Design a protein around this nucleic acid. Structure first.
Ligand SMILES: [K+]
Ligand SMILES: [Mg+2]
Length: 425
DNA sequence: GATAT
RNA sequence: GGCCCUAAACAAAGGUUUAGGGGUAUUGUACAGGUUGUGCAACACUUGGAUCCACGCUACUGAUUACAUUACAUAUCUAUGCGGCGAGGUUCACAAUUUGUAUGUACUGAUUGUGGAUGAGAAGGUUGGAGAAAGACCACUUAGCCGGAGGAUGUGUAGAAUUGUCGCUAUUCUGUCAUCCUCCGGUUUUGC
């Protein structure tokens, strides 16, 4: 068989409770609804992604940093092929309801639009440019994937497929994705005696089925979502279900913005309203009142309101608007400062590791009577300078080309000499 | 490998 | 202890409890069973040509049958750019001669062959194993940025820059020029 006829099939790289399968067995298995009705779903494996925000106070320069935790849960190989196949089925029915309601340009994330974040941010900044004096209201949903109510998700799933109730294979998948069960990966590796430093060594699955049934389940390692809300982040079906859940609210928010002569955009849980200035104080309370039917809440700490006025002939914002990795002040478009900061930390760690490897092999050349060598820097230039083809600078120059910004080019210009000075440091 | 959530 | 199957009990719910069983890597050969023709063929489906013939092709079923071979998500960009040349040796363990001896044996240096490892374009540490050695394997670990203003100093449409090195490409820069110092402002804007 050929993968090109079956776009849902992807081979995945992690270890789980079962082994990777071939295209022939996946295609024969997932196409039978009786197999889906009789399937034995394995638990998800789970861990937390760690993130830090550092924010010194600008009055007295005191340290403050906050740890942020994102719970992540990923499914087994055969389960991941079942979810990908049914997400492929649900996407075609979802896109027809997108085209019916003219929502094609409002809903941005997780759709195969052949567009990136640069084009979405460019479209938002061109709307403010055409609209003139206006306000941008930015809203964020609080705990989006963890707070989806299961009955609302079931009702939205029946409308997309167009039935009164879910069929049996769809209902089995809905049961597995809502009342899900998960096993903590570190506890499983501790109990089974698997090294956290090298797990794929002389094994192709985490354990035997006897070892699963005796050591995993009887030790209490399976934790079941018995609350009435939440779906796991890390399944192949979850992002589509997050788009399906929000559809009627997207229709209502497009109508609300269009009544007032404005525009509406949503990228996952990130929402942008571009409205005339007289509505900008009411808007967050109107959106907080109409989203209570979805049982999800706005994160009121993350609300940002910006205002654009003409100063001379140039449109000027009172503070710059951040949107999808870019900064816009009314005329100029810049990259986020945190993306350039992240590039700087990655570059410095790479150069420091290259110097450590240089020192390590120079000791060996001294021991065996060979002449010392300098720093090899093909890989450093491929990773961290413009000669590379798949790095941060190709993204930056691509963004400077698309958005027509000399300011992005002036941001990217000192990065060559900083890499050279870090090498000479 | 790079970007957005 | 979630999930699936079987059986029972209470009843009729997209049910609860008890008891027992289970978790399909890959590619083939046997073996076992269905549906059917007249013991031993035949088996699926999209599609084409005139029920029949043919192409594509998951080829009646087998995880619950044997045997054997082979080895974090979604969307987007792109797939450490490609190709020559370094390389003579060094090290470790055996084996065969000969180098100096004692009595073929017991030592000792060097030449000659076979096998492990290694230079090559940066994946770091440890008195930790294994090992004949290994640069390999196993075990345990590993304020910053952006915008603006003032200065001080240098400098100028073809040329410059970029990997151990060369070639073919490719990308970036070129007076709102570069490095460094000072001041002001921003950073709900960092997915292990
Ligand atoms: K080369
Ligand atoms: Mg926001």
């Amino acid at each position: 068989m050929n993968n090109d006829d079956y776009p849902w099939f992807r081979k995945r790289g992690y270890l789980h409770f079962d082994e990777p399968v071939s295209l022939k067995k996946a295609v024969k298995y997932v196409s039978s609804p009786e197999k889906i009705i009789k399937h034995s779903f394995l638990p998800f494996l789970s861990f937390e992604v760690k993130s830090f925000k550092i924010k010194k106070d600008k009055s007295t320069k005191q340290l403050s940093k906050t740890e942020k935790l994102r719970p992540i849960a990923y499914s087994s190989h055969l389960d991941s092929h079942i979810y990908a196949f049914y997400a492929e089925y649900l996407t075609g029915h979802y896109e027809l309801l997108i085209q019916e309601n003219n929502l094609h340009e409002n809903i941005l994330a997780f759709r195969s639009l052949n567009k990136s974040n640069i084009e979405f941010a460019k479209r938002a900044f061109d709307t403010i440019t055409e609209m003139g004096e206006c306000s941008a209201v930015a809203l964020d949903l609080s705990g989006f994937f963890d707070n989806l109510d299961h009955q609302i998700l079931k009702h939205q799933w029946c409308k997309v497929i167009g039935t009164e109730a879910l069929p049996q294979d769809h209902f089995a998948i809905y049961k597995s994705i809502t009342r899900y069960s998960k096993v903590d990966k570190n506890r499983a590796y501790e109990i089974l005696g698997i090294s956290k430093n090298n797990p794929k060594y002389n094994r192709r699955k985490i354990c035997t089925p006897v070892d699963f049934r005796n050591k995993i389940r009887k030790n209490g390692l399976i934790i079941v979502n018995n609350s009435q809300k939440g779906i796991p982040q890390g399944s192949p079906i979850s992002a589509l279900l997050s788009n399906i859940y929000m559809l009627d609210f997207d229709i209502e928010m497009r109508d609300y913005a269009q009544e007032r002569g404005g525009h509406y955009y949503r990228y996952c849980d990130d929402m942008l309203f571009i409205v005339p200035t007289k509505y900008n104080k009411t808007l967050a309370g109107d959106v907080a009142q109409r989203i209570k039917h979805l049982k999800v809440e706005l994160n009121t700490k993350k609300t940002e309101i910006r205002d654009f006025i003409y100063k001379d002939s140039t449109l000027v914002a009172n503070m710059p608007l951040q949107y999808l990795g870019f900064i816009f002040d009314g005329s100029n478009i810049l990259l986020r400062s945190s993306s350039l900061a992240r590039y700087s930390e990655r570059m410095k760690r790479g150069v420091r590791l290259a110097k450590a490897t240089m020192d390590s092999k120079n000791r060996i050349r001294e021991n065996k009577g060979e002449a010392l060598k300098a720093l090899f820097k093909k890989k450093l230039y491929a990773r961290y300078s413009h000669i590379g083809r798949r790095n941060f600078l190709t993204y930056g120059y691509r963004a400077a080309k698309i958005m027509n910004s000399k300011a992005i080019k002036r941001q990217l210009k000192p990065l060559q000499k900083r890499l050279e000075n870090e090498i000479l440091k």
